[PDB]
Design a protein around this ligand. Structure first.
Ligand SMILES: Cc1cccc(Nc2cc(S(=O)(=O)O)c(N)c3c2C(=O)c2ccccc2C3=O)c1
Ligand SMILES: Cc1cccc(Nc2cc(S(=O)(=O)O)c(N)c3c2C(=O)c2ccccc2C3=O)c1
Length: 421
């Protein structure tokens, strides 16, 4: 059983992950056949955190690269393609300093070319790529692209597809198959997968990832309240003003060089702070999500992964609270946000370095779903929070790999004698 391999570096905003995929040479074109072989998490920040010292971006990857040398058998190395894709962190760096951004890419390129894998390039994904490839990953792994039934009795309608909601560090994406007419070409996607047309909606909200949201809520709290209602009572920190406003996401909020900001465990005021992130006041289309962006109604099942999954896992596994309904999700965030700092710490016996931020991130998810995308009780119950399908991390990495390696055919071998006609 001869296996081929492929590696993707997912250079996210606050960190980098490497995923190695494997698949039998013989059957590489069946849907769901590629699975994850191993992965590795790179220590320290994302490649964009090295703008001021671009050689370290490259170097940060060495340890995970060595692991890849070990995970992929030595005689497959040279025919194993290697890709790096970078997301909103490098898109944000691109607005700040396209030159710093260019040096970061060159530095990772130089490190990755030293390795004996088939290096295929370091690129920044568009926001459309990042949402569409995550939708691909999830539906590929769950075999939603198979045509179900048999001759003379095909399943009708066609097998439904899973929508994808990805919460990264610096943007968030929503992508799903829709029947609604398109009102904006920027959001419109057409795929031809295994002989089938999939009409797909996608949008990436830059500056709406987990970390940039936290930064914006902090600047917003500082300006409206002088206390942080999303932070727990008894928690405080000295905020350096200059750093709060340095991100493209917060510089629009820039108004004694250090200010002490204390939490108040205030779920109401936290929810009000979060709801101001979603500008729902204008819509130049028939219908919108927020900030004037076209969005047809959400429909079908969704997988919500990356930070959606980890935040909900915290609510259920560590807070011990149900989240099966929007209402229950809302209640879970209230209870979480109302914990004092000592109460919250007492429920987590480990080292949680970002414990004070769970309240805000949870409030953010609840409002993004309800006020942003307009899930309600009925549609929310088709949302599954999961980080994994078929032994593979759900992300855009796999779909990106499948696409650049050309492992999903547009049509079927022989057009399957044309019986999906
Ligand atoms: C790949 C990997 C390996 C070991 C630990 C983690 N933990 C995480 C990995 C990711 S990732 O960026 O989606 O990869 C991630 N987004 C998160 C975590 C988290 O542990 C996490 C915890 C609490 C809130 C949010 C997150 C979170 O978003 C991720
Ligand atoms: C609530 C919140 C806000 C901003 C960032 C995170 N991310 C994280 C928070 C924690 S924590 O220590 O449990 O607090 C955590 N352990 C992780 C993360 C992570 O983001 C993360 C990403 C990639 C690999 C591992 C981790 C990780 O272990 C979580």
């Amino acid at each position: 059983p001869a296996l081929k391999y492929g590696i993707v570096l997912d250079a996210g905003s606050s960190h980098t992950s490497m995923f190695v995929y494997k698949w039998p040479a013989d059957k590489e074109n069946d849907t769901g056949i590629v699975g994850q072989h191993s992965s590795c998490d790179v220590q320290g920040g994302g490649i964009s955190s090295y703008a001021n010292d671009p050689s370290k971006a490259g170097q940060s990857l060495v340890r995970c690269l060595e692991q890849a040398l070990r995970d992929v058998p030595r005689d497959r190395h040279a025919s194993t393609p290697l890709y790096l894709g970078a997301t909103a962190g490098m898109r944000l760096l691109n607005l700040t300093s396209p030159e710093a951004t260019a040096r970061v890419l060159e530095a990772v390129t130089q490190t990755l070319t030293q390795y004996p894998f088939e290096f295929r390039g370091a690129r920044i994904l568009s926001g459309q790529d990042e949402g569409v490839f995550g939708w691909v990953t999830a539906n590929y792994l769950l075999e939603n692209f198979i045509k179900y039934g048999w001759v003379g009795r095909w399943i009708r309608p066609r097998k439904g597809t899973l929508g994808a909601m990805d919460l990264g560090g610096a943007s968030t994406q929503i992508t799903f198959e829709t029947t609604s007419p398109s009102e904006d070409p920027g959001n419109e996607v057409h795929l031809r997968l295994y002989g089938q047309h999939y009409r797909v909606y996608t949008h990436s909200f830059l500056c709406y990832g987990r970390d940039q949201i936290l930064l914006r809520l902090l600047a917003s709290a500082l300006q409206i309240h002088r206390f942080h209602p999303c932070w727990p009572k008894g928690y405080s920190t000295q905020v350096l003003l200059q750093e709060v406003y340095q991100s493209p996401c917060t510089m629009g909020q820039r108004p004694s060089a250090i200010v002490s900001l204390s939490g108040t465990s205030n779920a109401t005021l936290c929810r009000d702070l979060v709801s101001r992130l979603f500008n729902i006041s204008s819509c130049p289309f028939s219908q919108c999500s927020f900030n004037g962006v076209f969005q047809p109604p959400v429909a079908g099942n969704f997988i919500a992964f990356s930070a959606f999954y980890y935040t909900v896992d915290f609510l259920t596994t560590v807070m011990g609270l149900p989240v099966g309904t929007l209402k229950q999700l809302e209640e879970a965030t209230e209870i979480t946000c109302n914990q004092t700092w000592t109460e919250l710490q007492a429920r987590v016996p480990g080292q949680k370095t970002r414990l004070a931020d769970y309240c805000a991130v949870a409030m953010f998810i609840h409002q993004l779903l309800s006020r942003g995308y307009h899930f309600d009780e009925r549609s929310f119950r088709e949302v599954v929070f999961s980080k994994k399908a078929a032994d593979t991390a759900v992300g855009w990495a796999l779909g990106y790999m499948l696409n650049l390696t050309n492992l999903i055919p547009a049509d079927l071998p022989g057009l399957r004698k044309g019986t999906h006609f």
